[PDB]
Amino acid sequence: PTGSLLSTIEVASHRRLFDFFSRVRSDANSLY
Amino acid sequence: DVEFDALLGSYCNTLSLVRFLELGLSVACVCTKFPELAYMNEGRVQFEV
Amino acid sequence: MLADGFETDIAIPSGISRPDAAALQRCEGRVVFLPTIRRQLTLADVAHESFVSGGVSPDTLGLLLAYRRRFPAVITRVLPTRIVACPLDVGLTHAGTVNLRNTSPVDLCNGDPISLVPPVFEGQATDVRLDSLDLTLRFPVPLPSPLAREIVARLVARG
Amino acid sequence: EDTEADVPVTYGEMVLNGANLVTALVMGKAVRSLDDVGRHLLEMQEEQL
Amino acid sequence: EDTEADVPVTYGEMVLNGANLVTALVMGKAVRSLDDVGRHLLEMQEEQL
């Protein structure tokens, strides 16, 4: 169809790269 | 006296190398790669309906 | 390595809220009862859900008798995807030193042998409950041995 | 009705627009030496393009 | 579907001609084609995988 309307499927994620390099003590509600 | 033993052939197997996208099932997928997946706790997929 | 240490991988599931994910990181030096010496286990095996007998969740004295049928392990690092433990019956680490943590109201000293005791005391029954997974983690209490022979004697003589 | 199909081979990739983190050591406390943390934001946000 | 087939004529030949005859008399054992099996174990040894 030429009158259609696409959209980008979005992937939102909380990656945590630095838990694997060292210890973390974060809060319960840290959207870091 | 002349007597002997013999090996009369050695037969082997070849493993079939199956790729997934060569299958007919792969329509139900969208095979896109996370280069990082191990670093993720909660993932949500958001799109407009 | 195979002889000196033995690392297990207690896997963490997919769906865990962050009020639940930030409680496990405060569980760094604990005591964990594995049923086997498998290298891949899940939290449903560690928790009190797998602890129940046929239908009957036992009290603090029957809680003893299913400890010694299991394998005590100590958590060494809590990763986001898994919990890494070391069972004490195999071996400690290469260096042979693993840090524990007091849950007792009692100080420790040098050279005291540690026996572990259930959460028997008042003001002590602290069970880390994960709400998204319905999991309680009844952590035992590392006590000095001349306390641990008293409390078992207080519990057996009471029955 | 058919025997041979047309099938894609490549996986799918992504456009990364991620929250970025800056850690850089600074020797001294000057104006131009503290703006290099700010330049490092637009140095790394340029590399995502 | 078909009436007339294509069928080979010569049976298979396996004789101890050559260096295999030595191993049947001196060693007392006879690998099937030592003139090839002993050959192919050398280019595997030095060249490739």
To which residue do tokens 């139900």 refer?
B28
Interface test with A, best of B39, B44, B46, B47 (most A CBs within 10 A): B39
Provide the experimental method for this PDB entry.
cryo-EM
Q: What does the block give as tokens for C153?
A: 């004697």
Q: What is the sign, positive or negative, of the torsion defined by CA atoms of C26, C29, C31, C37?
A: positive
- Alpha carbon distances (Å) from D14 to A10, B20, B45, C152, D9: 10, 21, 14, 60, 16
- Alpha carbon distances (Å) from C95 to B28, C74, C88, C99, C110: 50, 15, 14, 12, 19
- Alpha carbon distances (Å) from D9 to B17, B25, C27: 16, 14, 46
User: Cβ of B12 under 8 Å from any chain E Cβ?
Assistant: no
Residue B11 CA to residue B13 CA, distance in Å, equals 7
Report the 10 Å Cβ neighbour count for C152.
15
State the greatest distance between any 2 C-alpha atoms of chain E, in Å, as a whole number. Answer: 55
C41 touches C82 (CB < 8 A)? no
Helix (H) or strand (E) holding E39: helix E34-46
Q: What does the block give as tokens for B40?
A: 């993720």
- Alpha carbon distances (Å) from A8 to A13, B17, B21, B34, E26: 16, 35, 23, 17, 78
Annotated resolution, angstroms = 4.2
Q: Which residues contact C83 (CB under 8 A, 6 or more apart)?
A: C9, C10, C11, C12, C24, C32, C43, C75
Residues forming beta bridges with residue C8, ordered by sequence position:
C85
Residue of A nearest to C23 (CA): A28
C71 touches C89 (CB < 8 A)? yes
D24 touches D34 (CB < 8 A)? no
C-alpha closest to that of C145 among C117, C120, C123 = C117
**DSSP letters of A1-32?**
--S----PPEEEEEE-GGGTTS-----SS---
B26: which DSSP letter?
G
Residue of E nearest to B7 (CA): E31
Chains C and B touch (3+ CB pairs under 8 A): yes
Q: Which residues of C121-149 are buried (b: 16+ CB within 10 A; e: fewer)?
A: eeeeeeebebeebebebebbbbbbeeebe
- Alpha carbon distances (Å) from B29 to B33, B45, D2, D10, E4: 12, 15, 22, 13, 49
Q: Do E30 and B2 touch (CB under 8 A)?
A: no
Residue C104 CA to residue C69 CA, distance in Å, equals 23
**What is the distance in angstroms between the Cα of C17 and the nearest Cα belonging to chain A?**
9
**DSSP letters of C24-75?**
HTT--S--EEESS--SEEEHHHHSTTTT--SS----TTHHHHTTTTSEEEEE
Residue A3 CA to residue D4 CA, distance in Å, equals 32
Residue C48 CA to residue A5 CA, distance in Å, equals 52
C120 touches C31 (CB < 8 A)? no
**CA angle in degrees (0–180, nearest 5) for C41-C43-C48:** 120
Chain B residues with at least one Cβ partner in C under 8 Å = 38-39, 41-42
